[PDB]
Design a protein around this motif. Structure first.
Motif, PDB file in Angstrom:
ATOM      1  N   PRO A  59       0.816  -1.219   0.000  1.00  0.00           N
ATOM      2  CA  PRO A  59       0.000   0.000   0.000  1.00  0.00           C
ATOM      3  C   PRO A  59       0.848   1.266   0.000  1.00  0.00           C
ATOM      4  O   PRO A  59       0.322   2.380  -0.037  1.00  0.00           O
ATOM      5  N   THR A  60       2.166   1.091   0.043  1.00  0.00           N
ATOM      6  CA  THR A  60       3.087   2.221   0.048  1.00  0.00           C
ATOM      7  C   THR A  60       3.635   2.490  -1.349  1.00  0.00           C
ATOM      8  O   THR A  60       3.892   3.637  -1.716  1.00  0.00           O
ATOM      9  N   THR A  61       3.812   1.426  -2.126  1.00  0.00           N
ATOM     10  CA  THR A  61       4.331   1.548  -3.482  1.00  0.00           C
ATOM     11  C   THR A  61       3.331   1.013  -4.503  1.00  0.00           C
ATOM     12  O   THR A  61       3.692   0.717  -5.642  1.00  0.00           O
ATOM     13  N   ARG A  62       2.075   0.893  -4.086  1.00  0.00           N
ATOM     14  CA  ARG A  62       1.024   0.393  -4.965  1.00  0.00           C
ATOM     15  C   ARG A  62       1.527  -0.781  -5.801  1.00  0.00           C
ATOM     16  O   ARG A  62       1.200  -0.900  -6.983  1.00  0.00           O
ATOM     17  N   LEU A  63       2.322  -1.644  -5.180  1.00  0.00           N
ATOM     18  CA  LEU A  63       2.871  -2.809  -5.866  1.00  0.00           C
ATOM     19  C   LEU A  63       2.153  -4.084  -5.434  1.00  0.00           C
ATOM     20  O   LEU A  63       1.976  -4.335  -4.242  1.00  0.00           O
ATOM     21  N   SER A  64       1.742  -4.886  -6.411  1.00  0.00           N
ATOM     22  CA  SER A  64       1.042  -6.134  -6.132  1.00  0.00           C
ATOM     23  C   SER A  64       1.587  -7.268  -6.996  1.00  0.00           C
ATOM     24  O   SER A  64       1.375  -7.296  -8.208  1.00  0.00           O
ATOM     25  N   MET A  65       2.291  -8.200  -6.362  1.00  0.00           N
ATOM     26  CA  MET A  65       2.866  -9.336  -7.070  1.00  0.00           C
ATOM     27  C   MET A  65       2.116 -10.623  -6.736  1.00  0.00           C
ATOM     28  O   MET A  65       1.214 -10.625  -5.899  1.00  0.00           O
ATOM     29  N   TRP A  66       2.495 -11.711  -7.395  1.00  0.00           N
ATOM     30  CA  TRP A  66       1.857 -13.003  -7.168  1.00  0.00           C
ATOM     31  C   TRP A  66       2.774 -13.931  -6.377  1.00  0.00           C
ATOM     32  O   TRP A  66       2.333 -14.949  -5.846  1.00  0.00           O
ATOM     33  N   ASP A  67       4.051 -13.572  -6.305  1.00  0.00           N
ATOM     34  CA  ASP A  67       5.030 -14.373  -5.578  1.00  0.00           C
ATOM     35  C   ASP A  67       5.718 -13.543  -4.498  1.00  0.00           C
ATOM     36  O   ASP A  67       5.544 -12.325  -4.432  1.00  0.00           O
ATOM     37  N   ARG A  68       6.498 -14.209  -3.655  1.00  0.00           N
ATOM     38  CA  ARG A  68       7.211 -13.532  -2.577  1.00  0.00           C
ATOM     39  C   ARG A  68       8.434 -12.793  -3.113  1.00  0.00           C
ATOM     40  O   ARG A  68       9.409 -13.399  -3.558  1.00  0.00           O
ATOM     41  N   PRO A  69       8.382 -11.454  -3.070  1.00  0.00           N
ATOM     42  CA  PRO A  69       9.477 -10.604  -3.547  1.00  0.00           C
ATOM     43  C   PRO A  69      10.707 -10.683  -2.648  1.00  0.00           C
ATOM     44  O   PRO A  69      10.620 -11.118  -1.500  1.00  0.00           O
ATOM     45  N   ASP A  70      11.849 -10.261  -3.178  1.00  0.00           N
ATOM     46  CA  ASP A  70      13.096 -10.281  -2.422  1.00  0.00           C
ATOM     47  C   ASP A  70      12.981  -9.435  -1.160  1.00  0.00           C
ATOM     48  O   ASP A  70      13.393  -9.855  -0.078  1.00  0.00           O
ATOM     49  N   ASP A  71      12.420  -8.239  -1.304  1.00  0.00           N
ATOM     50  CA  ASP A  71      12.251  -7.332  -0.175  1.00  0.00           C
ATOM     51  C   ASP A  71      11.823  -8.094   1.075  1.00  0.00           C
ATOM     52  O   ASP A  71      12.068  -7.652   2.199  1.00  0.00           O
ATOM     53  N   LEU A  72      11.182  -9.239   0.872  1.00  0.00           N
ATOM     54  CA  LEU A  72      10.719 -10.063   1.983  1.00  0.00           C
ATOM     55  C   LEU A  72      11.629 -11.272   2.183  1.00  0.00           C
ATOM     56  O   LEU A  72      11.813 -11.745   3.304  1.00  0.00           O
TER      57      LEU A  72
END
Length: 73
Positions: free
Chosen positions: A37-50
């Motif tokens: 909700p901070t970068t309006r980013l929505s992926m389908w898999d677990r991103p590196d950031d995590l």
């Protein structure tokens, strides 16, 4: 010149990830994705950031929608 509404399904439960601005979101197809909700980013898999954090996993491991009064069980 457009792609389209990524994925066609509404979420069932949402929970903000600790430490990271990401938010674990579950679906009706026994699935779950990561939202930001901070970068309006929505992926389908677990991103590196995590990638690397344990919290992110724990959440996915034990979803809220489930506990607190199970439907099937």
């Amino acid at each position: 010149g457009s792609s389209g509404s990524s994925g066609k399904a509404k979420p069932v439960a949402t929970a903000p990830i600790p430490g990271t601005p990401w938010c674990v979101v579950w679906t009706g197809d026994e699935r779950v994705f990561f939202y930001n909700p901070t970068t309006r980013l929505s992926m389908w898999d677990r991103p590196d950031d995590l990638i690397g954090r344990a919290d992110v996993d724990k959440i996915i491991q034990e979803p809220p929608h489930k506990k607190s009064g199970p439907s099937s069980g």
